[PDB]
Amino acid sequence: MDETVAEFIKRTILKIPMNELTTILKAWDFLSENQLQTVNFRQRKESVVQHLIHLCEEKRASISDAALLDIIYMQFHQHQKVWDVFQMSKDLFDMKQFKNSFKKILQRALKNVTVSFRETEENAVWIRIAWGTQYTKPNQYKPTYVVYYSQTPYAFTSSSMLRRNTPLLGQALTIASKHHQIVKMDLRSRYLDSLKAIVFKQYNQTF
């Protein structure tokens, strides 16, 4: 693996608290049960991380594997970002249809972008987008996270600056599922569970 992907995995593991480490890594399901047995987790973090980075080399970790561990960190630490709610207005054959559509729209608009996915059993997708330009590489340390619940008109994003790549994200989301318009709602929270609670409650009154 490249030193860029190796560094990203290092900084990701470094910010994981020690007690959580063994649970996140199992959830990641990239390093094997056998590989992880060789690691003793009861010393300095710096020793733990270099052993784990070695194990990623053995397993030939790509950027996609790195991006997936990052999603899992975020899934276990949703509170670290402020989530905005977005509403769409109006069928897919599949979730795979959405993922390929969405990925292409972004990677055609700009050339350098990392678009990764994780599916949860709620018919929901986590999207992680690391933005780059036509000329510059993707910034893996300032990514955008999207949580789209497929059978709803609702999508939840983590806004950091609300950049020039923010109208494009709306566009891509809107096009990739069978929707015509997107609008930002005036609903912010650090807690996604609490936002789900308001938008899916008032989605049940109207329909």
Short mmCIF file of N, CA, C and O in Angstrom, two decimals, residues 2-80:
data_model
loop_
_atom_site.label_atom_id
_atom_site.label_comp_id
_atom_site.label_asym_id
_atom_site.label_seq_id
_atom_site.Cartn_x
_atom_site.Cartn_y
_atom_site.Cartn_z
N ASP A 2 0.29 2.32 -0.64
CA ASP A 2 0.93 3.64 -0.75
C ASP A 2 1.10 4.29 0.62
O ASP A 2 0.42 3.92 1.58
N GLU A 3 2.01 5.25 0.71
CA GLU A 3 2.25 5.97 1.97
C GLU A 3 1.13 6.94 2.32
O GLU A 3 0.95 7.29 3.49
N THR A 4 0.36 7.37 1.31
CA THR A 4 -0.83 8.19 1.52
C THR A 4 -1.93 7.41 2.23
O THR A 4 -2.47 7.88 3.23
N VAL A 5 -2.25 6.21 1.72
CA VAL A 5 -3.25 5.33 2.33
C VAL A 5 -2.79 4.82 3.72
O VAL A 5 -3.60 4.74 4.65
N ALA A 6 -1.49 4.54 3.84
CA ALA A 6 -0.87 4.10 5.10
C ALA A 6 -0.93 5.17 6.19
O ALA A 6 -1.10 4.84 7.36
N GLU A 7 -0.77 6.44 5.80
CA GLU A 7 -0.83 7.57 6.72
C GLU A 7 -2.26 7.80 7.21
O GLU A 7 -2.49 7.99 8.41
N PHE A 8 -3.21 7.78 6.27
CA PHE A 8 -4.64 7.96 6.55
C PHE A 8 -5.16 6.92 7.54
O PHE A 8 -5.87 7.29 8.48
N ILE A 9 -4.80 5.66 7.34
CA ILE A 9 -5.15 4.57 8.27
C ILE A 9 -4.49 4.80 9.65
O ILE A 9 -5.13 4.53 10.68
N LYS A 10 -3.26 5.31 9.67
CA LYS A 10 -2.56 5.65 10.93
C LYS A 10 -3.33 6.70 11.74
O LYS A 10 -3.65 6.46 12.90
N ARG A 11 -3.63 7.84 11.11
CA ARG A 11 -4.35 8.94 11.79
C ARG A 11 -5.78 8.57 12.23
O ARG A 11 -6.28 9.10 13.23
N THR A 12 -6.41 7.65 11.50
CA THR A 12 -7.75 7.15 11.81
C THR A 12 -7.73 6.27 13.06
O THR A 12 -8.54 6.45 13.96
N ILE A 13 -6.78 5.33 13.12
CA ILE A 13 -6.62 4.44 14.27
C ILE A 13 -6.17 5.21 15.51
O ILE A 13 -6.64 4.92 16.61
N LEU A 14 -5.29 6.20 15.32
CA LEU A 14 -4.80 7.06 16.42
C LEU A 14 -5.90 7.79 17.20
O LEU A 14 -5.78 7.95 18.41
N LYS A 15 -6.95 8.23 16.50
CA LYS A 15 -8.07 8.94 17.14
C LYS A 15 -9.15 8.02 17.75
O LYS A 15 -10.02 8.50 18.48
N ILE A 16 -9.08 6.72 17.46
CA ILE A 16 -9.95 5.73 18.09
C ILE A 16 -9.49 5.47 19.54
O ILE A 16 -8.33 5.09 19.74
N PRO A 17 -10.38 5.67 20.53
CA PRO A 17 -10.08 5.28 21.92
C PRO A 17 -9.79 3.78 22.07
O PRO A 17 -10.45 2.96 21.42
N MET A 18 -8.84 3.46 22.94
CA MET A 18 -8.29 2.11 23.09
C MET A 18 -9.33 1.02 23.36
O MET A 18 -9.24 -0.07 22.78
N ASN A 19 -10.29 1.31 24.22
CA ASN A 19 -11.38 0.37 24.53
C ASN A 19 -12.33 0.08 23.35
O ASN A 19 -12.91 -1.01 23.27
N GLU A 20 -12.45 1.04 22.44
CA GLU A 20 -13.30 0.91 21.25
C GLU A 20 -12.59 0.18 20.10
O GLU A 20 -13.26 -0.38 19.22
N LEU A 21 -11.25 0.20 20.13
CA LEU A 21 -10.40 -0.22 19.01
C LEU A 21 -10.74 -1.60 18.45
O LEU A 21 -10.83 -1.79 17.24
N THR A 22 -10.94 -2.54 19.36
CA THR A 22 -11.14 -3.94 19.01
C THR A 22 -12.55 -4.18 18.42
O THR A 22 -12.78 -5.18 17.73
N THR A 23 -13.47 -3.25 18.68
CA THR A 23 -14.85 -3.36 18.23
C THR A 23 -14.98 -2.75 16.84
O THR A 23 -15.61 -3.33 15.96
N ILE A 24 -14.36 -1.59 16.65
CA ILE A 24 -14.31 -0.91 15.36
C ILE A 24 -13.59 -1.79 14.32
O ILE A 24 -14.06 -1.93 13.20
N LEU A 25 -12.46 -2.39 14.71
CA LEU A 25 -11.69 -3.24 13.81
C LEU A 25 -12.45 -4.48 13.37
O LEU A 25 -12.39 -4.85 12.19
N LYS A 26 -13.18 -5.11 14.30
CA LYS A 26 -14.07 -6.23 13.97
C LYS A 26 -15.18 -5.79 13.00
O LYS A 26 -15.44 -6.48 12.02
N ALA A 27 -15.77 -4.63 13.27
CA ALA A 27 -16.80 -4.02 12.41
C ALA A 27 -16.28 -3.74 11.00
O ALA A 27 -17.03 -3.87 10.02
N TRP A 28 -15.00 -3.36 10.92
CA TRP A 28 -14.31 -3.05 9.67
C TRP A 28 -14.13 -4.30 8.83
O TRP A 28 -14.23 -4.24 7.59
N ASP A 29 -13.88 -5.42 9.51
CA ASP A 29 -13.80 -6.76 8.92
C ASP A 29 -12.88 -6.81 7.68
O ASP A 29 -13.24 -7.35 6.62
N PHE A 30 -11.71 -6.21 7.83
CA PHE A 30 -10.68 -6.19 6.79
C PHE A 30 -9.49 -7.04 7.22
O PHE A 30 -9.10 -7.97 6.52
N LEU A 31 -8.90 -6.68 8.37
CA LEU A 31 -7.92 -7.52 9.04
C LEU A 31 -8.64 -8.73 9.60
O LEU A 31 -9.75 -8.60 10.14
N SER A 32 -8.04 -9.90 9.46
CA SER A 32 -8.67 -11.15 9.87
C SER A 32 -8.64 -11.34 11.39
O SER A 32 -7.87 -10.66 12.09
N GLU A 33 -9.49 -12.24 11.88
CA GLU A 33 -9.52 -12.65 13.28
C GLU A 33 -8.14 -13.16 13.72
O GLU A 33 -7.66 -12.80 14.81
N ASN A 34 -7.51 -13.96 12.86
CA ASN A 34 -6.15 -14.49 13.07
C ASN A 34 -5.07 -13.42 13.15
O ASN A 34 -4.22 -13.46 14.05
N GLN A 35 -5.11 -12.46 12.23
CA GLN A 35 -4.17 -11.34 12.21
C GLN A 35 -4.23 -10.55 13.52
O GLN A 35 -3.20 -10.24 14.10
N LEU A 36 -5.45 -10.27 13.98
CA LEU A 36 -5.69 -9.46 15.18
C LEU A 36 -5.26 -10.14 16.47
O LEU A 36 -4.92 -9.46 17.45
N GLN A 37 -5.28 -11.48 16.47
CA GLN A 37 -4.81 -12.27 17.60
C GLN A 37 -3.33 -12.03 17.92
O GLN A 37 -2.95 -12.01 19.10
N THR A 38 -2.53 -11.82 16.88
CA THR A 38 -1.08 -11.58 17.01
C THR A 38 -0.76 -10.25 17.70
O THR A 38 0.32 -10.08 18.26
N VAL A 39 -1.71 -9.31 17.64
CA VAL A 39 -1.57 -7.98 18.24
C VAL A 39 -1.94 -8.08 19.71
O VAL A 39 -3.05 -8.53 20.04
N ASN A 40 -1.03 -7.68 20.59
CA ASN A 40 -1.42 -7.45 21.97
C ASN A 40 -1.78 -5.97 22.12
O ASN A 40 -1.05 -5.08 21.68
N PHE A 41 -2.95 -5.74 22.71
CA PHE A 41 -3.56 -4.42 22.76
C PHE A 41 -3.27 -3.68 24.07
O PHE A 41 -3.77 -2.57 24.28
N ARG A 42 -2.44 -4.29 24.92
CA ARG A 42 -2.21 -3.79 26.28
C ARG A 42 -0.88 -3.03 26.48
O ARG A 42 -0.28 -3.09 27.56
N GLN A 43 -0.44 -2.30 25.45
CA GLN A 43 0.68 -1.36 25.59
C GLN A 43 0.41 -0.02 24.87
O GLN A 43 -0.69 0.20 24.37
N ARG A 44 1.42 0.86 24.87
CA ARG A 44 1.37 2.17 24.21
C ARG A 44 0.70 2.10 22.84
O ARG A 44 0.97 1.17 22.07
N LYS A 45 -0.18 3.06 22.56
CA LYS A 45 -0.94 3.11 21.30
C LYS A 45 -0.04 3.08 20.06
O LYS A 45 -0.36 2.39 19.09
N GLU A 46 1.08 3.81 20.12
CA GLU A 46 2.07 3.88 19.04
C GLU A 46 2.60 2.51 18.61
O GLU A 46 2.85 2.28 17.43
N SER A 47 2.76 1.60 19.58
CA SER A 47 3.13 0.21 19.31
C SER A 47 1.99 -0.57 18.66
O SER A 47 2.23 -1.38 17.76
N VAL A 48 0.77 -0.32 19.13
CA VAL A 48 -0.44 -0.96 18.59
C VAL A 48 -0.65 -0.55 17.13
O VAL A 48 -0.90 -1.42 16.28
N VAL A 49 -0.52 0.75 16.83
CA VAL A 49 -0.80 1.27 15.48
C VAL A 49 0.19 0.82 14.40
O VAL A 49 -0.23 0.57 13.27
N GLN A 50 1.47 0.70 14.75
CA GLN A 50 2.48 0.25 13.79
C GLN A 50 2.36 -1.25 13.47
O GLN A 50 2.65 -1.67 12.35
N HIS A 51 1.93 -2.02 14.46
CA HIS A 51 1.59 -3.43 14.26
C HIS A 51 0.37 -3.56 13.32
O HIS A 51 0.35 -4.43 12.44
N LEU A 52 -0.62 -2.68 13.51
CA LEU A 52 -1.83 -2.69 12.69
C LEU A 52 -1.57 -2.21 11.27
O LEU A 52 -2.10 -2.80 10.31
N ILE A 53 -0.75 -1.17 11.12
CA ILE A 53 -0.32 -0.65 9.81
C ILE A 53 0.46 -1.72 9.02
O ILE A 53 0.27 -1.86 7.81
N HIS A 54 1.29 -2.50 9.72
CA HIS A 54 1.96 -3.64 9.10
C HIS A 54 0.96 -4.67 8.56
O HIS A 54 1.12 -5.18 7.45
N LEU A 55 -0.06 -4.97 9.37
CA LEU A 55 -1.09 -5.94 9.01
C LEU A 55 -1.93 -5.51 7.81
O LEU A 55 -2.44 -6.36 7.06
N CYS A 56 -2.06 -4.20 7.64
CA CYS A 56 -2.71 -3.61 6.47
C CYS A 56 -1.86 -3.78 5.20
O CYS A 56 -2.41 -3.95 4.11
N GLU A 57 -0.53 -3.71 5.36
CA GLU A 57 0.42 -3.97 4.27
C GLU A 57 0.33 -5.41 3.77
O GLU A 57 0.23 -5.63 2.56
N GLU A 58 0.35 -6.37 4.70
CA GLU A 58 0.12 -7.79 4.42
C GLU A 58 -1.15 -8.01 3.61
O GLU A 58 -1.17 -8.79 2.65
N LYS A 59 -2.22 -7.31 4.00
CA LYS A 59 -3.54 -7.48 3.42
C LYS A 59 -3.77 -6.63 2.17
O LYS A 59 -4.80 -6.77 1.49
N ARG A 60 -2.79 -5.76 1.85
CA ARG A 60 -2.81 -4.88 0.67
C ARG A 60 -3.98 -3.88 0.70
O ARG A 60 -4.81 -3.83 -0.23
N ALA A 61 -4.04 -3.09 1.77
CA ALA A 61 -5.09 -2.10 1.96
C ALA A 61 -5.03 -1.03 0.87
O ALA A 61 -3.97 -0.45 0.62
N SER A 62 -6.16 -0.81 0.21
CA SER A 62 -6.30 0.29 -0.75
C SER A 62 -6.97 1.48 -0.07
O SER A 62 -7.33 1.40 1.11
N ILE A 63 -7.11 2.59 -0.80
CA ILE A 63 -7.80 3.78 -0.30
C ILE A 63 -9.27 3.50 0.07
O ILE A 63 -9.81 4.12 0.99
N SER A 64 -9.90 2.56 -0.64
CA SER A 64 -11.30 2.18 -0.40
C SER A 64 -11.50 1.53 0.95
O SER A 64 -12.51 1.78 1.62
N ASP A 65 -10.54 0.69 1.34
CA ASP A 65 -10.49 0.08 2.67
C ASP A 65 -10.28 1.13 3.76
O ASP A 65 -10.90 1.06 4.82
N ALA A 66 -9.42 2.10 3.47
CA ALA A 66 -9.12 3.21 4.37
C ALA A 66 -10.36 4.07 4.61
O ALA A 66 -10.72 4.36 5.76
N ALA A 67 -11.02 4.45 3.52
CA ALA A 67 -12.26 5.22 3.55
C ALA A 67 -13.40 4.51 4.31
O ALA A 67 -14.23 5.17 4.95
N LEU A 68 -13.42 3.17 4.24
CA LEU A 68 -14.43 2.39 4.95
C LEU A 68 -14.23 2.38 6.47
O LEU A 68 -15.21 2.45 7.22
N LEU A 69 -12.98 2.29 6.92
CA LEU A 69 -12.65 2.42 8.34
C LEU A 69 -13.03 3.81 8.86
O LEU A 69 -13.49 3.94 10.00
N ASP A 70 -12.86 4.83 8.02
CA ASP A 70 -13.24 6.19 8.36
C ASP A 70 -14.75 6.33 8.57
O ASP A 70 -15.17 6.94 9.55
N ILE A 71 -15.55 5.77 7.65
CA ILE A 71 -17.03 5.71 7.79
C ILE A 71 -17.41 5.09 9.14
O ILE A 71 -18.27 5.62 9.85
N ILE A 72 -16.76 3.98 9.48
CA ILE A 72 -17.07 3.24 10.70
C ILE A 72 -16.73 4.06 11.95
O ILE A 72 -17.51 4.10 12.89
N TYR A 73 -15.59 4.76 11.92
CA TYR A 73 -15.28 5.74 12.97
C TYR A 73 -16.42 6.76 13.14
O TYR A 73 -16.85 7.02 14.27
N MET A 74 -16.89 7.31 12.03
CA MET A 74 -17.97 8.30 12.04
C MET A 74 -19.29 7.71 12.55
O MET A 74 -20.01 8.36 13.30
N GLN A 75 -19.59 6.48 12.15
CA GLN A 75 -20.79 5.76 12.60
C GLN A 75 -20.81 5.54 14.11
O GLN A 75 -21.88 5.54 14.72
N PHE A 76 -19.63 5.33 14.69
CA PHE A 76 -19.45 5.17 16.13
C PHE A 76 -19.24 6.52 16.85
O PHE A 76 -19.17 6.55 18.08
N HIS A 77 -19.12 7.61 16.10
CA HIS A 77 -18.88 8.94 16.69
C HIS A 77 -19.64 10.06 15.98
O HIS A 77 -19.10 11.16 15.78
N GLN A 78 -20.91 9.79 15.64
CA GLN A 78 -21.77 10.71 14.89
C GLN A 78 -21.80 12.12 15.48
O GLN A 78 -21.98 13.11 14.76
N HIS A 79 -21.63 12.20 16.80
CA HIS A 79 -21.66 13.45 17.57
C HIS A 79 -20.54 14.44 17.20
O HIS A 79 -20.62 15.61 17.53
N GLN A 80 -19.50 13.95 16.54
CA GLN A 80 -18.35 14.81 16.22
C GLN A 80 -18.61 15.82 15.11
O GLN A 80 -17.83 16.77 14.94
#
